[PDB]
Amino acid sequence: KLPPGPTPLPVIGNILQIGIKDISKSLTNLSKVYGPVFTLYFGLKPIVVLHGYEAVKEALIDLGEEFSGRGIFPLAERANRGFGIVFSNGKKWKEIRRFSLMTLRNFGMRSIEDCVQEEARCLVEELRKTKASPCDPTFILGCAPCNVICSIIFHKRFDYKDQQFLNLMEKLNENIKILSSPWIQICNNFSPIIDYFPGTHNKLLKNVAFMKSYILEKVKEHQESMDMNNPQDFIDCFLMKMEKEKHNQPSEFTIESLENTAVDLFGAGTETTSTTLRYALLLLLKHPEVTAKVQEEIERVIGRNRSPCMQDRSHMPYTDAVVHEVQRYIDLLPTSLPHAVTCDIKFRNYLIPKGTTILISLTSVLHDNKEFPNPEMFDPHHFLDEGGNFKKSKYFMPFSAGKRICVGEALAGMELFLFLTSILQNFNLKSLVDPKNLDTTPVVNGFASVPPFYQLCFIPI
Numbered sequence: 001k002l003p004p005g006p007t008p009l010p011v012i013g014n015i016l017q018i019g020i021k022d023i024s025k026s027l028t029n030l031s032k033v034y035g036p037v038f039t040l041y042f043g044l045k046p047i048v049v050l051h052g053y054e055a056v057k058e059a060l061i062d063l064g065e066e067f068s069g070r071g072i073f074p075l076a077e078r079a080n081r082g083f084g085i086v087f088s089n090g091k092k093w094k095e096i097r098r099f100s101l102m103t104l105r106n107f108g109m110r111s112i113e114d115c116v117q118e119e120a121r122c123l124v125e126e127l128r129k130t131k132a133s134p135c136d137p138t139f140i141l142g143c144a145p146c147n148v149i150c151s152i153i154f155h156k157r158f159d160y161k162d163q164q165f166l167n168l169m170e171k172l173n174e175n176i177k178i179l180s181s182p183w184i185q186i187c188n189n190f191s192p193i194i195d196y197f198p199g200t201h202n203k204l205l206k207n208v209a210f211m212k213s214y215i216l217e218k219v220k221e222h223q224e225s226m227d228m229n230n231p232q233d234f235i236d237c238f239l240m241k242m243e244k245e246k247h248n249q250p251s252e253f254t255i256e257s258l259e260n261t262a263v264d265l266f267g268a269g270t271e272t273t274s275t276t277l278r279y280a281l282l283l284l285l286k287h288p289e290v291t292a293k294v295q296e297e298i299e300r301v302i303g304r305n306r307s308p309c310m311q312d313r314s315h316m317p318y319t320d321a322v323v324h325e326v327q328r329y330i331d332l333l334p335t336s337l338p339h340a341v342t343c344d345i346k347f348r349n350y351l352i353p354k355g356t357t358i359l360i361s362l363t364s365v366l367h368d369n370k371e372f373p374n375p376e377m378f379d380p381h382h383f384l385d386e387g388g389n390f391k392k393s394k395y396f397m398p399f400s401a402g403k404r405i406c407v408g409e410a411l412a413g414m415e416l417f418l419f420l421t422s423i424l425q426n427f428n429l430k431s432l433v434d435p436k437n438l439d440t441t442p443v444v445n446g447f448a449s450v451p452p453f454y455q456l457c458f459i460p461i
């Protein structure tokens with residue numbers, strides 16, 4: 001029956017072995033005793049944990065349908081985000097996920113690459129407006145992805161210093177901070193707390209309600225300026241599918257599921273790329289040896305004149321490896337989002353019940369020691385053959401794997417490559433703190449490995 005694991009005390013669960021400051025380390029430590037597959041108690045919730053590449057693959061690729069559910073911790077239950085993609089399950093999941101994926105496979109035409117590449121030219125124009133005086137790249141580096149997303153969801157685009165984008169951005173930023181908070185790790189060993197005590201959980205819920213409301217403005221006002229014969233973004237295409245569905249009659253595609261899908265994409269797309277850029281620049285300040293080898297390639301292959309394009313990546317194996325190494329090293333979502341099993345499933349001779357939540361240690365894979373010697377070192381040679389050519393890796397899965405893999409895997413692949421090479425063709429990065437001195441350590445890591453405060457100067461070439 002349920003796999004091995006430390007015996008959980010009767011209310012607190014296994015909180016005293018896993019702790020609250022650093023879940024993914026503890027999960028790594030417990031695995032060194034209970035093994036690849038074991039069982040924790042977050043209060044009274046059993047959580048099967050999966051550790052090796054071999055255990056993670058077998059579960060998500062090989063029993064892919066049985067592990068393709070979405071485990072719901074509570075905060076998400078009260079946030080009220082079950083319709084649409086991230087937090088939904090079952091049929092509603094599959095219908096909306098295939099639709100959403102289908103409608104992102106194409107933008108009007110304008111290709112998504114043209115959308116990104118233009119946004120990289122607006123980012124460069126705002127790194128120009130800092131007049132090389134030292135800044136915190138947080139709100140600039142967030143506005144680039146956010147714009148790309150806003151263009152896809154509802155067409156519009158924010159001015160980089162628009163006061164309305166600035167709320168949304170810090171609210172997204174604050175929410176991820178809070179979700180990685182120790183206090184939120186106490187809120188999951190005691191789900192009643194969430195409804196009776198005064199803390200940061202209550203603000204996260206406020207902020208979530210805000211974006212939800214904001215998106216719903218946009219979605220109402222899209223319904224009127226309708227025009228079947230002519231839609232021009234995601235929200236329109238979704239409303240068209242709502243009309244193409246009267247045969248189905250009982251929903252699948254409500255406004256409520258639109259409202260939600262739009263906010264899943266808008267938050268996930270902004271904050272996760274945003275955070276990844278921010279840390280990239282942070283790792284480039286820390287390793288100027290690398291930042292140079294990258295800027296050589298850019299000057300050699302792309303000029304200093306024309307926009308970089310995605311065709312450039314195959315002739316830039318250093319820059320391709322650096323971009324991979326950032327995502328591997330930083331380990332943005334150490335334990336992915338939690339899965340759940342859809343039916344009862346016998347797995348590695350154990351038999352887990354329908355519902356049982358599952359954690360994928362993605363750190364366990366990204367920071368594998370065989371596949372990646374000295375995994376805790378940021379080294380772009382982790383992704384380069386002896387020749388000096390890019391080597392792919394089955395162990396590079398920051399977007400997860402299986403049937404619930406990142407819906408935006410490819411869009412994000414582009415946003416990183418194009419925004420980073422656009423910055424580094426036009427700017428030298430001056431750290432205003434000795435590289436020997438700044439630490440690159442996440443300041444918290446519950447949900448997400450969020451980076452430290454830093455500043456830098458964007459000095460043109």
Ligand code: HEM
Nearest residue numbers: 085086265268269272273336337399400404406407408412
């Ligand atoms: C570096 C950038 C990104 C990273 C590292 C990332 C990572 C992830 C991860 C780990 C998941 C968990 C999926 C799972 O295992 O269940 C996920 C899900 C998701 N990501 Fe991304 N993501 C990124 C960018 C984006 C972008 C740009 C979008 C744009 C829509 C996006 C949309 C989603 C959505 C909708 C899900 C829900 C997955 C599902 O339920 O099917 N992500 N992402």
Ligand SMILES: CCCCc1nc(Cl)c(CO)n1Cc1ccc(-c2ccccc2-c2nn[nH]n2)cc1
Nearest residue numbers: 075076079172175176208211263267268271272448
């Ligand atoms: C649990 C609280 C309710 C869910 C929720 N509604 C909204 Cl709106 C947000 C954004 O702050 N959130 C939080 C949220 C955090 C991460 C994600 C996410 C999902 C898939 C892939 C990446 C991310 C992500 N976004 N930012 N960091 N990680 C989505 C929503």
